Amino acid sequence: GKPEHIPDPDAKKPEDWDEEMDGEWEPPVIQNPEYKG
C-alpha cells in the first residue's frame, strides 16, 4: 500500500548547498501519515 516513510517534495536543495563538494542533494522524509504496508 505505502512504505514505512514517505519522501519530502517541499524541501529543496539548500540555498547554501555545495554541489561541487557533495554532488547530489537528497531530500528528507516524513513519518508516513498512513503506513499500512
Query: Exposure string (b/e) for 4-33, b if CB count within 10 Å is 16 or more?
Result: eeeeeeeeeeeeeeeeeeeeeeeeeeeeee
Q: Dig out the grid coordinates for 11 from the structure.
A: 524541501
Place of cell 500500500: 1
Q: Are 2 and 35 spatial neighbours (Cβ–Cβ below 8 Å)?
A: yes
What was the structure determination method?
NMR
Q: In what helix (H) or strand (E) does residue 7 lie, and over which residues does it extend?
A: strand 5-7
